[PDB]
Amino acid sequence: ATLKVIGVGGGGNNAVNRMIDHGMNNVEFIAINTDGQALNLSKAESKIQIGEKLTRGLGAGANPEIGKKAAEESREQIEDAIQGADMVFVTSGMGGGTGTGAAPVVAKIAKEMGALTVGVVTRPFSAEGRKRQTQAAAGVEAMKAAVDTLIVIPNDRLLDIVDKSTPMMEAFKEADNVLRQGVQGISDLIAVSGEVNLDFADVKTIMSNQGSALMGIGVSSGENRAVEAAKKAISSPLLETSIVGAQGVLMNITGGESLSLFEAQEAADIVQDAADEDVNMIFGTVINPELQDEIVVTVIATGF
Ligand SMILES: Nc1nc2c(ncn2[C@@H]2O[C@H](COP(=O)(O)OP(=O)(O)O)[C@@H](O)[C@H]2O)c(=O)[nH]1
Numbered sequence: 001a002t003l004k005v006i007g008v009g010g011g012g013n014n015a016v017n018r019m020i021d022h023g024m025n026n027v028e029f030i031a032i033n034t035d036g037q038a039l040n041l042s043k044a045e046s047k048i049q050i051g052e053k054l055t056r057g058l059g060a061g062a063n064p065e066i067g068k069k070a071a072e073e074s075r076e077q078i079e080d081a082i083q084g085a086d087m088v089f090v091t092s093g094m095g096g097g098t099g100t101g102a103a104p105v106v107a108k109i110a111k112e113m114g115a116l117t118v119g120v121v122t123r124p125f126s127a128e129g130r131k132r133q134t135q136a137a138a139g140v141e142a143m144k145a146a147v148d149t150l151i152v153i154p155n156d157r158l159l160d161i162v163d164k165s166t167p168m169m170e171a172f173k174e175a176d177n178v179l180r181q182g183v184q185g186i187s188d189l190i191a192v193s194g195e196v197n198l199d200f201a202d203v204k205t206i207m208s209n210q211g212s213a214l215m216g217i218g219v220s221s222g223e224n225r226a227v228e229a230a231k232k233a234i235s236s237p238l239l240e241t242s243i244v245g246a247q248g249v250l251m252n253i254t255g256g257e258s259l260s261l262f263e264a265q266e267a268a269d270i271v272q273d274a275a276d277e278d279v280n281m282i283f284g285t286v287i288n289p290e291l292q293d294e295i296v297v298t299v300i301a302t303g304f
Contacts, residue, residue: 001086001087001186001190001200001203002028002084002085002086002087003026003027003028003085003086003087003088003089003183003186003187004027004028004029004030004082004085004087004088004089004115005019005024005027005028005029005030005088005089005091005179005183006029006030006031006032006081006082006088006089006090006091006106006110007029007030007031007032007042007044007091007092008032008033008071008090008091008092008098008099008102008103008106009032009033009034009067009092009093009096009097009098009099009100009102009103010033010035010038010059010093010096010098010099011091011092011093011096011099011122012032012090012091012092012093012099012103013031013032013033013038013039013042013044014172015091015172015175015176015179016029016030016031016042016043016044016091017041017042017043017044018172018173018176019176019179019180020043020044021043022173022176022180024180024183024184025187026187026191027183027187028045028046028085029043029044029045029046030044030046030047030048030081030082031044031046031047031048032047032048032050032071032078032102032106033048033049033050033059033098034049034050034051034052034054034055034057034058034059034060034066034067034070034097034098034102035055035057035058035059035098036049036052036057036058037057037058038059046081048074048077048078048081050070050071050073050074050077050078050098050102051066051067051069051070051071051073051074053073054066054069054070054073055070059096059097059098060096060097060098060101061097062096062097062132062135063097063101064096064097064100064101064135064138064139065101066097066098066101067096067097067098067099067100067101067102067103068101068102068104068105069101070098070101070102071101071102071105071106071109072105075105075109078105078106078109079109079113082109082110082113082115083113085110085113085115086115086116086200087115087116087117087118087186087200087203088107088110088115088116088117088118089118089119089120089179089182089183090103090106090107090110090117090118090119090120090121090143090147091119091120091121091179092119092121092122092139092143093121093122093124093155094121094122094123094124094135094136094137094139094140094143095123095124095128095132095133095135095136095139099121099139100135100136100138100139101139103119103121103139103143104139104142104143104145104146105146107119107143107146107147108146111146111147111148116148116203116204116207116208117146117147117148117149118147118148118149118150118151118182118207118213119143119144119146119147119149119150119151120151120153120178120179120182121139121140121143121150121151121152121153122152122153122154122155122175123136123137123140123152123153123154123155123156123240124136124155125155125156125158125159126156140152144211144212148207148208148209148210149207149210149211149212149213149302150211150212150213151178151179151182151212151213151214151215151239151241152212152239152240152241153175153178153238153239153240154238154240155175157237157238157239158171158172158174158175158238160237161174161237161238174238175238178215178236178238178239181215181216181217182215182216182300184217185215185217185252185298185300186200186203186300188298189202189203189252189284189298192286192288194252194254194284194285194286195285195286195287196283196284196285197284198250198252198282198284202250202282202284203250203300205282206248206249206250206280206282206300206302207300207302210248210302210303211302211304212240212241212302212304213241213300213301213302214234214236214239214241214242214243214246214299214300214301214302215299215300215301216232216233216234216235216236216298216299217232217233217296217297217298217299218230218231218232218233218234218235218296218297218299219232219294219295219296219297220232220294220295221292221293221294221295222293225263225293225294225295226253226255226263226264226266226267226295226297227263227266227267227270229253229267229295229296229297230251230266230267230268230270230271230297230299231270231274232297233271233297233298233299234270234271234274234299234301241304243271243274243275243299243301244274244275244276244277245275245276245277245303245304246271246275246277246279246280246301246302246303246304247275247277247278247279247280247302247303247304248279248280248301248302248303249271249272249275249279249280249281249282249299249300249301249302249303250282250284250298250299250300250301251267251268251271251281251282251283251284251297251298251299251300252283252284252285252286252297252298253267253283253284253285253286253295253296253297253298254285254286254287254288254291254295254296254297254298255286255287255288255291255294255295255296256287256288256289256290256291256292256293256294257287257289258293259285259287259295263295264283264285267295267297268281268283271299271301275301277303279301279303280302280303
């Protein structure tokens with residue numbers, strides 16, 4: 001499948017730059033912004049400046065109606081950049097003028113172009129104020145109506161994973177990992193024919209028109225490795241939507257030749273027990289002999 005990651009506005013384009021710097025192989029990046037200064041510095045191969053008639057090449061100055069109109073007026077350019085995608089991840093920080101208004105338009109276009117469309121967006125820090133939060137909430141609601149599945153990261157959760165000295169840019173990279181892991185997990189599932197295979201049609205069944213989503217990867221080794229990996233896959237502190245209530249799950253377990261039936265069952269039970277629900281299990285298994293003693297559990301959960 002052709003996977004694309006589209007960053008919309010400042011924070012979304014930040015995430016695209018950091019992900020390209022980190023390294024990401026078979027994924028096309030697209031950078032969309034009103035802010036031409038920031039776009040000029042993007043590392044993405046595909047860049048779309050939107051709304052230059054509206055903003056004269058600046059940002060949207062905290063007005064989401066300008067981000068929205070900018071995206072609508074560049075619809076054809078956005079279609080052309082998306083065309084061919086089977087799956088699109090639209091990432092954006094909600095609460096500003098460009099992302100809040102343009103990201104739901106971009107997502108709507110991607111879904112109308114036939115792409116499985118996942119939004120990964122932030123809510124602003126409480127320190128940014130109540131009206132930024134209210135503006136962001138309208139963006140989140142518009143995003144939810146425009147995507148297949150939505151992952152919301154409240155930026156306040158970053159305050160739960162730092163100490164008093166953690167550089168702000170290091171905290172931002174942690175939030176990127178939510179998107180990177182989801183993209184990488186799907187990429188890796190598509191690329192290999194598993195002993196019990198999952199492919200893009202399984203991703204579509206779990207993610208299409210399902211609302212809120214969780215995506216996680218956990219890795220462990222040694223004793224209780226499978227349970228530990230499964231718990232890590234479902235336990236991110238940054239997510240608005242936890243695993244509790246999932247009624248839809250794609251789960252893949254990858255290990256070396258030692259991967260046991262028993263421990264795969266243990267892993268499957270961890271997900272359903274934390275789900276506290278009757279959940280939609282599509283379960284896959286991959287034997288990767290180069291893994292030795294490590295196990296990797298990938299989880300996509302929906303149905304909330
Ligand atoms: N986690 C994270 N949040 C960001 C980042 N940049 C901006 N934000 C958040 O995104 C919101 C909108 O900022 P920005 O994307 O620059 O606005 P826009 O360009 O007008 O869409 C801000 O109010 C912050 O809450 C980033 O790199 N990481």
